Scaffold this active site. Structure first.
Site, PDB file in Angstrom:
ATOM      1  N   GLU A 171     -95.384  -5.480  -5.024  1.00 53.85           N
ATOM      2  CA  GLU A 171     -93.654  -5.101  -4.780  1.00 53.85           C
ATOM      3  C   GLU A 171     -93.332  -5.476  -3.468  1.00 53.85           C
ATOM      4  O   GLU A 171     -93.032  -6.497  -2.906  1.00 53.85           O
ATOM      5  CB  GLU A 171     -93.013  -3.592  -5.190  1.00 53.85           C
ATOM      6  CG  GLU A 171     -91.501  -3.712  -5.222  1.00 53.85           C
ATOM      7  CD  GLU A 171     -91.659  -3.877  -3.918  1.00 53.85           C
ATOM      8  OE1 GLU A 171     -91.592  -3.235  -2.548  1.00 53.85           O
ATOM      9  OE2 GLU A 171     -89.816  -5.128  -3.652  1.00 53.85           O
TER      10      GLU A 171
ATOM     11  N   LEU B 249     -91.278   4.057   4.100  1.00 51.86           N
ATOM     12  CA  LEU B 249     -90.957   3.482   2.699  1.00 51.86           C
ATOM     13  C   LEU B 249     -91.212   5.491   2.709  1.00 51.86           C
ATOM     14  O   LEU B 249     -92.466   6.013   2.631  1.00 51.86           O
ATOM     15  CB  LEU B 249     -91.697   2.872   2.778  1.00 51.86           C
ATOM     16  CG  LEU B 249     -91.185   1.717   3.380  1.00 51.86           C
ATOM     17  CD1 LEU B 249     -91.792   0.274   2.055  1.00 51.86           C
ATOM     18  CD2 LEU B 249     -89.791   1.372   2.257  1.00 51.86           C
TER      19      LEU B 249
HETATM   20  N1  LIG Z   1     -87.118  -0.104   1.004  1.00 53.03           N
HETATM   21  C1  LIG Z   1     -86.631  -0.624   1.684  1.00 53.03           C
HETATM   22  O1  LIG Z   1     -86.295  -1.937   1.387  1.00 53.03           O
HETATM   23  C2  LIG Z   1     -86.270  -0.410   2.754  1.00 53.03           C
HETATM   24  C3  LIG Z   1     -85.793  -1.758   4.347  1.00 53.03           C
HETATM   25  C4  LIG Z   1     -85.942  -1.583   5.643  1.00 53.03           C
HETATM   26  C5  LIG Z   1     -85.396  -0.142   6.091  1.00 53.03           C
HETATM   27  N2  LIG Z   1     -86.704   1.137   5.317  1.00 53.03           N
HETATM   28  C6  LIG Z   1     -86.856   2.378   5.446  1.00 53.03           C
HETATM   29  O2  LIG Z   1     -84.626   2.423   6.296  1.00 53.03           O
HETATM   30  C7  LIG Z   1     -85.304   3.135   7.471  1.00 53.03           C
HETATM   31  C8  LIG Z   1     -85.032   2.510   8.810  1.00 53.03           C
HETATM   32  O3  LIG Z   1     -83.926   2.438   8.534  1.00 53.03           O
HETATM   33  P1  LIG Z   1     -82.105   3.308   9.073  1.00 53.03           P
HETATM   34  O4  LIG Z   1     -81.384   3.112   8.216  1.00 53.03           O
HETATM   35  O5  LIG Z   1     -82.662   4.828   9.384  1.00 53.03           O
HETATM   36  O6  LIG Z   1     -82.094   2.495  10.040  1.00 53.03           O
HETATM   37  P2  LIG Z   1     -82.782   1.061  10.836  1.00 53.03           P
HETATM   38  O7  LIG Z   1     -80.654  -0.066  10.519  1.00 53.03           O
HETATM   39  O8  LIG Z   1     -83.581   0.178  10.159  1.00 53.03           O
HETATM   40  O9  LIG Z   1     -82.148   0.605  12.499  1.00 53.03           O
HETATM   41  C9  LIG Z   1     -80.874   1.109  12.541  1.00 53.03           C
HETATM   42  C10 LIG Z   1     -79.885   0.944  14.205  1.00 53.03           C
HETATM   43  O10 LIG Z   1     -80.763   0.073  14.570  1.00 53.03           O
HETATM   44  C11 LIG Z   1     -79.397  -0.516  15.273  1.00 53.03           C
HETATM   45  N3  LIG Z   1     -77.777  -1.265  14.315  1.00 53.03           N
HETATM   46  C12 LIG Z   1     -78.469  -0.892  12.774  1.00 53.03           C
HETATM   47  N4  LIG Z   1     -77.175  -1.769  12.119  1.00 53.03           N
HETATM   48  C13 LIG Z   1     -77.324  -2.290  12.992  1.00 53.03           C
HETATM   49  C14 LIG Z   1     -75.149  -3.021  13.503  1.00 53.03           C
HETATM   50  N5  LIG Z   1     -74.753  -3.352  12.015  1.00 53.03           N
HETATM   51  N6  LIG Z   1     -75.027  -3.569  14.458  1.00 53.03           N
HETATM   52  C15 LIG Z   1     -75.972  -3.176  16.147  1.00 53.03           C
HETATM   53  N7  LIG Z   1     -77.083  -2.833  15.252  1.00 53.03           N
HETATM   54  C16 LIG Z   1     -77.262  -1.597  14.007  1.00 53.03           C
HETATM   55  C17 LIG Z   1     -78.879   0.500  15.534  1.00 53.03           C
HETATM   56  O11 LIG Z   1     -79.280   0.941  17.191  1.00 53.03           O
HETATM   57  P3  LIG Z   1     -79.044   1.463  18.494  1.00 53.03           P
HETATM   58  O12 LIG Z   1     -79.578   2.438  18.652  1.00 53.03           O
HETATM   59  O13 LIG Z   1     -79.957   1.092  19.463  1.00 53.03           O
HETATM   60  O14 LIG Z   1     -77.974   0.316  18.746  1.00 53.03           O
HETATM   61  C18 LIG Z   1     -78.927   1.318  14.884  1.00 53.03           C
HETATM   62  O15 LIG Z   1     -79.377   2.529  15.646  1.00 53.03           O
HETATM   63  C19 LIG Z   1     -87.159   3.191   7.596  1.00 53.03           C
HETATM   64  O16 LIG Z   1     -87.465   4.313   6.820  1.00 53.03           O
HETATM   65  C20 LIG Z   1     -87.855   1.796   7.186  1.00 53.03           C
HETATM   66  O17 LIG Z   1     -88.904   2.219   6.198  1.00 53.03           O
HETATM   67  C21 LIG Z   1     -86.381   0.592   3.621  1.00 53.03           C
HETATM   68  C1  LIG Z   2     -89.843  -5.066   6.855  1.00 58.75           C
HETATM   69  C2  LIG Z   2     -89.890  -3.804   6.221  1.00 58.75           C
HETATM   70  O1  LIG Z   2     -91.227  -3.703   5.609  1.00 58.75           O
HETATM   71  C3  LIG Z   2     -88.923  -2.815   5.371  1.00 58.75           C
HETATM   72  O2  LIG Z   2     -89.014  -1.381   5.193  1.00 58.75           O
HETATM   73  C4  LIG Z   2     -88.784  -3.530   4.244  1.00 58.75           C
HETATM   74  N1  LIG Z   2     -89.079  -3.379   2.853  1.00 58.75           N
HETATM   75  C5  LIG Z   2     -88.965  -3.636   1.986  1.00 58.75           C
HETATM   76  C6  LIG Z   2     -88.695  -4.414   1.740  1.00 58.75           C
HETATM   77  N2  LIG Z   2     -87.734  -5.365   0.221  1.00 58.75           N
HETATM   78  C7  LIG Z   2     -88.935  -4.986  -0.625  1.00 58.75           C
HETATM   79  N3  LIG Z   2     -88.183  -5.518  -1.631  1.00 58.75           N
HETATM   80  N4  LIG Z   2     -90.067  -4.088  -0.340  1.00 58.75           N
HETATM   81  C8  LIG Z   2     -89.658  -3.824   0.644  1.00 58.75           C
HETATM   82  O3  LIG Z   2     -91.417  -3.299   1.247  1.00 58.75           O
HETATM   83  N5  LIG Z   2     -87.114  -5.465   3.169  1.00 58.75           N
HETATM   84  C9  LIG Z   2     -87.866  -4.332   3.737  1.00 58.75           C
END
Ligand SMILES: NC(=O)c1ccc[n+]([C@@H]2O[C@H](COP(=O)([O-])OP(=O)(O)OC[C@H]3O[C@@H](n4cnc5c(N)ncnc54)[C@H](OP(=O)(O)O)[C@@H]3O)[C@@H](O)[C@H]2O)c1
Ligand SMILES: C[C@H](O)[C@H](O)C1=Nc2c(nc(N)[nH]c2=O)NC1
Ligand SMILES: [Ca+2]
Length: 186
Positions: free
Chosen positions: A30, A22
């Site tokens: 949160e 994050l």
């Molecule tokens: N702030 C938040 O609420 C929140 C929530 C989640 C994540 N995050 C952050 O976001 C990052 C991860 O997110 P990201 O977007 O880079 O990756 P991701 O969606 O978490 O992972 C991507 C991989 O997952 C598979 N995938 C994704 N969408 C797919 C679908 N519709 N069908 C099939 N496979 C799918 C594929 O893997 P393959 O390459 O194996 O096919 C794609 O390479 C981290 O920094 C996490 O901390 C924040």
């Molecule tokens: C599941 C993992 O912690 C992931 O990055 C997510 N974090 C958050 C989330 N949703 C909220 N509101 N806050 C988080 O920190 N959805 C997914």
């Protein structure tokens, strides 16, 4: 399924991540909110299901996996088997959605929550299915390298009030944020 739920925390540019984590340091509250919402089912005997992508799964500290008390489903095209700790692997959202409706999952599962990342949120946003979007808007700018897809303001109507969601702006660790509920009705 009957309806989807998505939860995300976004900073001002709509960033959600950086360097695989994050963008901000930890916000205990949160986070308890994300736990409390994703964890709480309204039917004894059921657990909710959380659907997330490969990267989001590995972002979770290993000893902390799988998210306790929810059925963990990882999406990946490249994996052959459910990573150590995951309950299930699915090749796409569609596939995940069908698994959920299968017998064994159906009577076990209460709510379905999409927990990201970008590509999972998008795909879920596009389904012509009833959907509630729980967004935490963090009123500050942190460098981010991953982003929240654009929500269609014509479909996703922001609710002015929802139960168990504080209405006022929140503060913690000198940061302010607010909870918002967006609702799509098909
Ligand atoms: N702030 C938040 O609420 C929140 C929530 C989640 C994540 N995050 C952050 O976001 C990052 C991860 O997110 P990201 O977007 O880079 O990756 P991701 O969606 O978490 O992972 C991507 C991989 O997952 C598979 N995938 C994704 N969408 C797919 C679908 N519709 N069908 C099939 N496979 C799918 C594929 O893997 P393959 O390459 O194996 O096919 C794609 O390479 C981290 O920094 C996490 O901390 C924040
Ligand atoms: C599941 C993992 O912690 C992931 O990055 C997510 N974090 C958050 C989330 N949703 C909220 N509101 N806050 C988080 O920190 N959805 C997914
Ligand atoms: Ca890949």
């Amino acid at each position: 399924v009957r309806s989807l739920n998505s939860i995300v925390a976004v900073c001002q540019n709509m960033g959600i991540g950086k360097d695989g984590n994050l963008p901000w340091p930890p916000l205990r509250n949160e986070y308890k909110y994300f736990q409390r919402m994703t964890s709480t089912s309204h039917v004894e005997g059921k657990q909710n299901a959380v659907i997330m992508g490969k990267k989001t799964w590995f972002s979770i500290p290993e000893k902390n996996r799988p998210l306790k008390d929810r059925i963990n489903i990882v999406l990946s095209r490249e994996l052959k088997e459910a990573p150590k700790g995951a309950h299930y692997l699915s090749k796409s959202l569609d596939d995940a959605l069908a698994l959920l409706d299968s017998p064994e999952l159906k009577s076990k599962v209460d709510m379905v929550w999409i927990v990201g990342g970008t590509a999972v949120y998008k795909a879920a946003m596009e389904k012509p299915i009833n959907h509630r979007l729980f967004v935490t808007r963090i009123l500050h700018e942190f460098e981010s390298d991953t982003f929240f897809p654009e929500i269609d303001y014509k479909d996703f109507k922001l609710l002015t009030e929802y139960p168990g969601v504080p209405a006022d702006i929140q503060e913690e660790d000198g940061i302010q944020y607010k909870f918002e509920v967006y609702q799509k009705s098909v």
